[PDB]
Design a protein around this nucleic acid. Structure first.
Length: 248
DNA sequence: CTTATGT
DNA sequence: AATAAG
C-alpha cells in the first residue's frame, strides 16, 4: 500500500519533518527597527488548559524552547494558540512575494497530463529551521500558574503568522525539488506553498512519479498527509478547484 | 485580545 | 462615526 511503501514520507508514520538540506533561516529587520515587547493579555484558565497540551507537544518536539528576549508578542486563544505577530511583521524587512496566484499556477497544466496526484505537506513551516540569531524575534510569554513557570518561549522553526513564511517556504521547497524536476522532465509539478500537484500522461507514469516524489519528499525531511492525499486519480480537488477532464 | 478595513 | 485576521 502507499502508506506502508513510503513510511518516511507520510506525516502519520514518519515523525515531524525537518528540511535537512535547508540552512537555518536568518530574518533581516528593517533598517530602523528596535525590539517591541507587548504584554500578554491575561488568559482564562479555560483557554490556558485548552492551549497547554499543544505547547507541551511543541516543547517536546523542540519546536518551542525557553528564552529571554527583548521581543514579545501576545498569544491569543482561538482551543489552539494563535500568536499576534503584527508588530513583529511591521519591523521585518519586506521580501518580493514569489508565490504565484492559483489562477496563474494552474495555467501550467496542459491537456496531455490528466492523471493527478495531490499531496498536502503537514506542518510545512515547522520543517524550516530558524537561525538562533532570529529566534528571539518570535518570543511570547507562557505561564503555568500551577507549575510555577512564568517566562518566555520562542520558535526554533518558521512560525505561523509571520508575514514571510509562505514565500520563504515556497522558495525553500523549490530549491529542494529542483533536481526532482530535472530527473522527471515528463512530469508536471505545481507548487503552492504546502499544496502540491503532480500531473502525468498515464496512470503508470503517475504511479511511478508519485513513488519518486514521496521518496524524495521524505528523504528531504518533508511530510505529506496520508489522510488527505489524492493518488493517481483522473479527478482531484486542488487549490479549491475540481480538476476534471482538463477543466477548471 | 487588538487592529485594519460600508450604510 | 460589523467583519476578518494575527
Amino acid at each position: 500500500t502507499w502508506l506502508s511503501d513510503f513510511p518516511q514520507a507520510w506525516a502519520e508514520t514518519g515523525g515531524m519533518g525537518l528540511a535537512v538540506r535547508q540552512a537555518p533561516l536568518i530574518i533581516p529587520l528593517k533598517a530602523t527597527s528596535t525590539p517591541v515587547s507587548i504584554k500578554q493579555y491575561p488568559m482564562s484558565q479555560e483557554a490556558r488548559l485548552g492551549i497547554k497540551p499543544h505547547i507541551q507537544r511543541l516543547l517536546d518536539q523542540g519546536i518551542l524552547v525557553p528564552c529571554q528576549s527583548p521581543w514579545n508578542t501576545p498569544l491569543l486563544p482561538v482551543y489552539r494558540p494563535v500568536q499576534d505577530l503584527r508588530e513583529v511583521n511591521k519591523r521585518v524587512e519586506d521580501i518580493h512575494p514569489t508565490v504565484p496566484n492559483p489562477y496563474n499556477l494552474l495555467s501550467g497544466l496542459p491537456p496531455s497530463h490528466q492523471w493527478y496526484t495531490v499531496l498536502d505537506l503537514k506542518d510545512a513551516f515547522f520543517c524550516l529551521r530558524l537561525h538562533p540569531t532570529s529566534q528571539p524575534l518570535f518570543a511570547f510569554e507562557w505561564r503555568d500558574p500551577e507549575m510555577g513557570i512564568s517566562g518566555q518561549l520562542t520558535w526554533t522553526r518558521l512560525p505561523q503568522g509571520f508575514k514571510n513564511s509562505p514565500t520563504l517556504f515556497d522558495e525553500a521547497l523549490h530549491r529542494d525539488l529542483a533536481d526532482f524536476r530535472i530527473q522527471h522532465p515528463d512530469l508536471i509539478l505545481l507548487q503552492y506553498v504546502d499544496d502540491l500537484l503532480l500531473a502525468a500522461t498515464s496512470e503508470l507514469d503517475c504511479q511511478q512519479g508519485t513513488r519518486a516524489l514521496l521518496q524524495t519528499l521524505g528523504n528531504l525531511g518533508y511530510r505529506a498527509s496520508a489522510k488527505k492525499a489524492q493518488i493517481c486519480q483522473k479527478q482531484v480537488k486542488y487549490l479549491g478547484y475540481l480538476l476534471k477532464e482538463g477543466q477548471r
